[PDB]
Design a protein around this nucleic acid. Sequence first.
RNA 1: GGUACCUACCAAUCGUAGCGUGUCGACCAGCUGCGAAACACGCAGCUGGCACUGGCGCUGUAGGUAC
Lengths: 212, 223
Amino acid sequence: SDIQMTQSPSSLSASVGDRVTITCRASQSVSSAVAWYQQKPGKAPKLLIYSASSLYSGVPSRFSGSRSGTDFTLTISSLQPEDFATYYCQQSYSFPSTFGQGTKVEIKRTVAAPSVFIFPPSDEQLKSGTASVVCLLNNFYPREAKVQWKVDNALQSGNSQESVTEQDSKDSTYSLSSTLTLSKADYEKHKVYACEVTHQGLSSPVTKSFNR
Amino acid sequence: EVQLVESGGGLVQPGGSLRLSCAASGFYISYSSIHWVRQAPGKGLEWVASISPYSGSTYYADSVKGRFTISADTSKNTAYLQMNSLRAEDTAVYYCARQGYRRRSGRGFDYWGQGTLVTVSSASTKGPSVFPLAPSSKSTSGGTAALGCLVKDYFPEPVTVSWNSGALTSGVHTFPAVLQSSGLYSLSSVVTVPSSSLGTQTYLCNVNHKPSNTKVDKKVEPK
RNA sequence: GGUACCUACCAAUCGUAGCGUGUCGACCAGCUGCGAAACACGCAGCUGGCACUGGCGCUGUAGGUAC
Ligand SMILES: CN(CCO)c1ccc2cc(/C=C(\C#N)c3ccc(C#N)cc3)sc2c1
Ligand SMILES: [Mg+2]
Ligand SMILES: [Mg+2]
């Protein structure tokens, strides 16, 4: 490829009203043919800025674009709740066009302890020859959490998949799910199944368990 | 008034071919350069191709140079992206975009195109097995119990999950899909609901996997 | 003689016998405004080249023609 657009930062957590600045560096000159887009999860991008400083019609005035040589800066003065999203820069000075890596702007809030739930496998799945035990960490902040599985007391490892949701639009919290998959026989062979969660909002690791 | 609706996505094998269409309304494509961008799952935007007005000149990214072909039908007001010799790096949501007018939003992409998913894999389409995640019988965590549905072993993306056929939306969390060791997707859709009203209320999860044309309605119930 | 004109006036150097002059335009590149317009095409303008166009000013020498 021809020109490279290196974007920074890759992400950040900002309170409402905070000013945020994202910077894209072109590997070589691109004149002022730079654009900035905002993208929400599961949605198409929207033109925020064009020509390295001009505002697109309909875009609020807290979004600004500036240029200094080969450096371009998108500035959100006084970040608002509807502004959390992934921002991308683009160079259209020459083909092929180049996009930045993107900057994911998420909202910062007070820490919320997760709500831990455990779900045993259903009889249908057991009949199918497999068992999936699910641990659910509901509505917590920050995103970082630790979850460990224990059958009997053997610290499990290498048999659990993890997924996490995007920041909630209403309360800005996160939700996470761990899934431990065993065979029918393997699942019958042990009694107690437990999920241990450590998080900044929990003074002590919380355990949620059941008996087959 | 200006809309860009594309179609043609789906699943295709490595080395296979596939064409995407992008119908435009509210403006004539012949008077604007039209671009194809793409975004791999959980990745950044990747410019793919472009076609200029009045000359028809075509430009391509290095990753797809020689394999993709952009074209346009003015009588149908539609752009087209042919993709040949597809690799596993070509799987992504493909967006059709229209470059703005020179004297307003110069070279900026106003008005993008919803999107269409293209999956490149040798795995075969399979519908999900839907199991229930029953409410915790032990206590109920302060008047709010949690239930859910487990959508396992399906391919390709996507699936859609609703609760009570759209009647229930509060406190719903449908988690992103993850590739299991088997090569298929799996996720869970959970909900938190008043425990006191658990027995009285009925909770059903509606899973739809259009690729395999499978639709499942699963009860939960405390047992 | 005079005036006007015709022809010729080494090579190199755009050209000229020589000196000076680089254009209403052509051509090569680059830039800008505009045409629904990044390239290409079109219209208008600018900058640099070039000398296709061999014009214009001045000054001749030889021969010759005509008043
Ligand atoms: C001062 N210098 C040297 C600097 O390098 C020069 C050299 C040559 C030159 C040549 C010139 C010729 C023209 C002009 N104007 C010209 C005009 C009209 C037509 C026609 N029909 C054809 C041509 S002017 C000029 C100036
Ligand atoms: Mg000579
Ligand atoms: Mg000549």
